[PDB]
Design a protein around this ligand. Structure first.
Ligand SMILES: Nc1nc2c(ncn2[C@@H]2O[C@H](COP(=O)(O)OP(=O)(O)OP(=O)(O)O)[C@@H](O)[C@H]2O)c(=O)[nH]1
Lengths: 847, 84, 56, 54
């Protein structure tokens, strides 16, 4: 209000009054594979809700790729929120909060940030490409985060204009895409109530370039508006599947009348669209005005003079109109904030739904306690001040209202992370222009000013002097792991504080960015890939810090493991020479580390469930199965600590006094690692004898923890240590002829091809392969250059694999600037990483 | 040309609070769930006042459209795009 | 030397004269310890000479 | 291999009517940047100028 804004089809007063009714709000995130049409849709909708903001005839106005690099690269880099009022098929209006998410596999963190504050997902799938890598990854992520899933099969015009498939085969292609999505959903979810089918209204067909968007119901409504006497809802139930129309009986049967009879979808939906497009693009001068007369569209004379693409856009816009099918989909199959509040609190709130504050939050009552969760941070173009962005799950936030901001480490006993701040202004975020408001009720998305100071990634904003028992929302769980690592250093050491400030700012911007300072005074940035780090450095050098920053060569993060059991049972004693621990280290069973990290097992379980799980899944006896102490460096680390101390040999009651310290020592030791200060993975540590001093003045504190860490290191070093590379999963789409070239490019970088397969209904092929992360820099460029741009690849982290060599072997001599043979890659990876970290040149294997 | 504006406005009222006065002088105030082209209103959480003035609570109500005298709609619908 | 002239931000690597005629691998390699040692020995030598008589 | 290592080391350590051939580029060592896979255009598109039958 009182802000100069573009004129809309609606009026902002209606938008403001809709925000109070939480049953007319839909918090939706648009996600899909890269370049699958997710952005026109937003303008393809902004235009329909903004008469003056139109797309250029020869250039598409992205309107949500508002960034510089977004506009030149043409690649979605950051999520852009859009709040619009969209009419329904029945004429009703709902307030839509849409999250436009990037489709590149490197920027999945933005997608998770959008998924946190959303109640439903609209998955965009190219009709020609089909289900690609990121489509599967986002389906898994969405059904895991307990979000309603709907599908929009975009770019259906490619079936007509590019591939020129017969309408029946276009129907087969669409049905195959829907079936693939259904199979993926059933794979990643147990309950059946997420069946996707256009009969249920779950799936929409669209072509954003030409302003086409219809469900079965919307097309049946077009028929009904033309011929009044039909009931479009019952008509829509017969427009998909193997149901054929019988024109003699005027009834729809499950059996085709005679022969050469087409399915209902082809006869009534696909064939008219084929004919419209064919008329417009082939007979614009000859027989277009007549067909336009038949459909009831009247185009003015200067309008018929347009080029073929704008003319097709205009004709389809006249025929179809607004995107009512999309709104029908998202109203029927995406819960309102009021209804979807309960799963959101169940999943993303640390206090659980059962908590008293959890109940008031699950009601989504806007007169309750304030509970706002922010997941994105948007920087003004000056790059000085940020604006937090998130949804108000309860209560109502006001401009000028003092608030209590809780960080990610805030617990009910450690209340030092919270900080009081004052809200400056509130903007209802639209893609480009912010509409300033005075208050935002529950269930809405708000851009907050004044709370950006004490938060890094995520926050929970509550009210001071109330909500004493207010916990936080769980930090985002990302799809990938940041592996690619680069080091930064200012050109002039005098301006180091400037680079540090810029590093803090980029850490605020990118949700999954991890900036750390190593022991050697080296500043390190972790990213997902080359494009990710490229854009991070572009922001760092140009947006936040105006200084010159040197960049080191890209490198990956390694992990350390073992391959047999320790030869001699290690032991280590405290400086008091009274407390002594004996441990051995052995490799974990295959597939157990992944179970641990993926929370298939939790130490929060009672010893009974832990024991039965281990017994039935990995052949563990009850004694060892219930003997688990800790679960790696974190609560879900890929390492296990087990006590084999016999009750007779050691008194278990006294062992319990040092259990809580041996656990911490083991966690810290696995966090650091002895080889090259890297994480330890897939290692099982068994305690064999723990001699404990009776006097508590000798044990506990800073005496037993270092002994535990040292014994962990020594036990690890007996069993043959190995290094671990991160392995990337590459999916390549390329024509048939360039498949061999893809093989040739992969073979040079230690690549191993898993499978190549045709894309059904498309002339291309998909090659899926595994490549080491370190042997992947420039792989995309090599593939796109050797194939003259006809092959494109997206790489994503998959798993950890052992480096061929042996890290602890001094016999190998390495020259400074030559690639090494595989037989001793591990030795180089180990010593060079040690030199980079600033440690000694070699380890000291001992007891 | 076919369906009048007031019916559209009534369609917009779904989900809000509405008070309903039938020919029997009975006042039904509650959350309007659904409406049709005719005034058939499916509406919920009813605070119902009879002609004498007795007030009752009735969670689900479906009123025949022919038997509505007038319907009082929330004031924010005055800003509906359809009312412009 | 560092007690007399503290170097918190590692700025000692900026004013170091090198023999640019030699190849890069044959020049002096400006590691922090070596640079600090060279600066320290130069400062020690400079301190012995009073500035009024002659300067280095 | 040898040119590979040399490139690594290098990176990290009169009216002339006709152009001099010393100004040529694309004298590369990587076989992927010399024997570039030729676009076939589904076997139906062709490069401009050159004879079709060829
Ligand atoms: N043939 C065809 N092309 C389309 C259609 N819609 C969009 N495109 C084009 O396909 C490309 C997709 O660009 P965007 O729509 O911005 O991509 P996106 O889906 O937002 O994905 P990101 O790049 O990850 O942000 C652009 O060249 C569009 O102009 C469509 O319906 N048909």
């Amino acid at each position: 209000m009182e802000q100069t804004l573009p004129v809309t089809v609606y009026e902002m007063d209606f938008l403001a009054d809709l925000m109070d009714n939480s049953e007319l709000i839909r918090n939706v995130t648009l996600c899909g594979h890269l370049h699958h049409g997710k952005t026109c849709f937003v303008d393809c909708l902004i235009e329909q809700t903004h008469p003056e903001i139109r797309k250029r005839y020869d250039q598409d106005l992205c309107y949500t790729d508002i960034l510089f690099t977004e506009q030149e690269r043409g690649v979605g880099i950051k999520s852009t929120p859009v709040t619009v009022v969209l009419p329904d098929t029945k004429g009703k209006s709902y307030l839509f909060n849409i999250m436009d998410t990037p489709g590149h596999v490197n920027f999945s963190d933005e997608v998770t940030a959008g998924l946190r504050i959303s109640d439903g997902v609209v998955l965009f799938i190219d009709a020609a490409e089909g289900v690609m890598l990121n489509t599967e990854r986002l389906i898994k992520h969405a059904v895991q985060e307990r979000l309603a899933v709907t599908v929009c099969i975009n770019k259906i015009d490619r079936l007509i204009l590019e591939l020129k498939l017969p309408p029946t085969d276009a129907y087969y292609k669409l049905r195959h895409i829907v079936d693939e999505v259904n199979g993926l959903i059933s794979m990643y979810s147990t309950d059946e109530n997420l069946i996707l089918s256009p009969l249920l209204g779950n799936v929409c067909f669209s072509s954003s370039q030409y302003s086409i968007c219809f469900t079965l119901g919307s097309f049946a409504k077009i028929y009904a508006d033309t011929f009044g006497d039909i009931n479009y809802q019952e008509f829509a139930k017969r427009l998909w599947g193997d149901i054929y129309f019988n024109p003699k009986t005027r009834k729809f049967t499950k059996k085709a009348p005679t022969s050469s009879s087409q399915r209902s979808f082809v006869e009534f939906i696909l064939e008219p669209l084929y004919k419209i497009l064919a008329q417009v693009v082939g007979d614009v001068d000859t027989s277009l005005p007549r067909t336009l007369d038949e459909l009831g569209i009247h185009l003015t004379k200067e309008e018929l003079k347009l080029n073929i693409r704008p003319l097709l856009r205009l004709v389809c816009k006249k025929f179809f109109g607004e995107f009512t099918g999309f709104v029908d989909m998202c109203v029927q199959h995406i819960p309102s904030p009021k209804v979807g509040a309960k799963p959101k609190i169940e999943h993303t709130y640390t206090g659980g739904v059962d908590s008293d504050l959890g109940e008031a939050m699950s009601d989504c009552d806007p007169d309750g306690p304030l509970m706002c969760h922010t997941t994105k941070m948007y920087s003004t173009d000056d790059g000085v001040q940020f604006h937090a962005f998130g949804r108000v799950l309860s209560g109502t936030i006001h401009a000028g209202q003092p608030v209590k901001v809780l960080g990610e480490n805030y617990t009910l006993e450690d209340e030092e992370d919270s900080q009081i701040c004052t809200v400056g202004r509130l903007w209802i975020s639209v893609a480009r222009y912010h509409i300033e408001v005075n208050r935002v009720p529950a269930g809405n998305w708000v851009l907050i000013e004044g709370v950006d100071q004490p938060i890094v990634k995520t926050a929970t904003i509550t009210e001071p002097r109330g909500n004493e028992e207010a916990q936080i929302f769980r930090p985002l769980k990302f799809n990938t792991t940041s592996v690619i690592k680069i080091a930064v250093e200012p050109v002039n050491p005098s301006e180091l504080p400037k680079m540090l400030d810029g590093l803090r700012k980029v850490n605020k911007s990118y949700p999954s960015l991890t900036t750390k300072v190593e022991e050697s005074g080296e500043h390190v940035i972790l990213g997902t890939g080359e494009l990710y780090l490229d854009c991070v450095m572009h922001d760092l050098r140009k947006m936040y810090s105006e200084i010159d920053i040197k960049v080191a060569d890209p490198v990956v993060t390694f992990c350390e493991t073992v391959v047999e059991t320790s030869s001699l049972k290690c032991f280590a004693e405290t400086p008091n020479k009274k407390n002594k621990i004996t441990m051995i280290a052995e490799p974990l069973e295959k597939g157990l580390a992944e179970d641990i990290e993926n929370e298939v097992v939790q130490i929060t379980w009672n010893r009974k469930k832990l024991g039965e799980f281990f017994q039935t899944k990995y052949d563990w006896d009850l004694l060892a199965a219930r003997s688990i102490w800790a679960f790696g460096p974190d609560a879900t680390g890929p390492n296990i600590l087990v006590d084999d101390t016999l009750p007779s040999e050691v008194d278990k009651a006294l062992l319990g006094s040092v259990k809580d310290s041996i656990v911490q020592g083991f966690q810290w030791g696995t966090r650091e690692g002895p080889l090259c200060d890297e994480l330890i993975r897939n290692v099982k540590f068994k305690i064999l004898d723990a001699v404990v001093a009776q006097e508590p003045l000798h044990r506990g504190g800073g005496q037993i923890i270092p002994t535990a860490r040292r014994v962990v290191y020594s036990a690890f070093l007996m069993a043959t240590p190995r290094l671990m590379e991160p392995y990337y999963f590459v999916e390549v789409q390329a024509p048939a002829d360039c498949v061999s070239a893809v093989y040739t490019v992969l073979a040079r970088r230690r690549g191993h091809v898993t499978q190549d397969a045709p894309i059904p209904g498309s002339p291309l092929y998909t090659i899926k392969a595994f490549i080491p992360a370190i042997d992947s820099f420039g792989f995309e460029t090599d593939l796109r250059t050797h194939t003259q741009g006809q092959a494109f690849s997206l790489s994503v982290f998959h798993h950890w694999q052992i480096v061929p060599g042996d890290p602890l072997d001094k016999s190998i001599v390495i020259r400074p600037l030559e690639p090494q043979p595989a037989p001793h890659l591990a030795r180089e990876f180990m010593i060079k990483t040690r030199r980079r970290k600033g440690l000694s040149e070699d380890v000291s294997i001992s007891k | 040309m076919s369906i009048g504006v007031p019916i559209k406005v009534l369609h917009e009222a779904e989900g809000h609070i509405v008070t309903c006065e039938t020919n029997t002088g009975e006042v039904y105030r509650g959350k309007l769930i659904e409406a049709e082209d005719n005034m058939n209103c499916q509406m919920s959480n009813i605070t119902v006042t009879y002609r004498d003035g007795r007030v009752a609570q009735l969670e689900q109500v479906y009123i025949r459209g022919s038997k509505i005298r007038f319907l009082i709609l929330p004031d924010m619908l005055k800003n509906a795009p359809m009312l412009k | 030397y560092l007690t007399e002239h503290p170097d918190p931000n590692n700025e000692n690597i900026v004013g170091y004269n090198n023999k640019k005629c030699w190849p890069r691998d044959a020049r002096m390699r400006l590691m922090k310890h070596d640079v600090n040692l060279g600066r320290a020995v130069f400062w020690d030598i400079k301190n012995r000479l009073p500035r009024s008589v002659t300067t280095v | 291999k040898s040119k590979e290592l040399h490139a690594i080391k290098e990176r990290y350590l009169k009216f002339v009517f006709e152009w001099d051939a010393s100004e040529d580029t694309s004298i590369d060592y990587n076989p992927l940047y010399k024997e570039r896979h030729q676009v076939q255009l589904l076997g139906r598109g062709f490069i401009a100028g050159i004879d079709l039958k060829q």
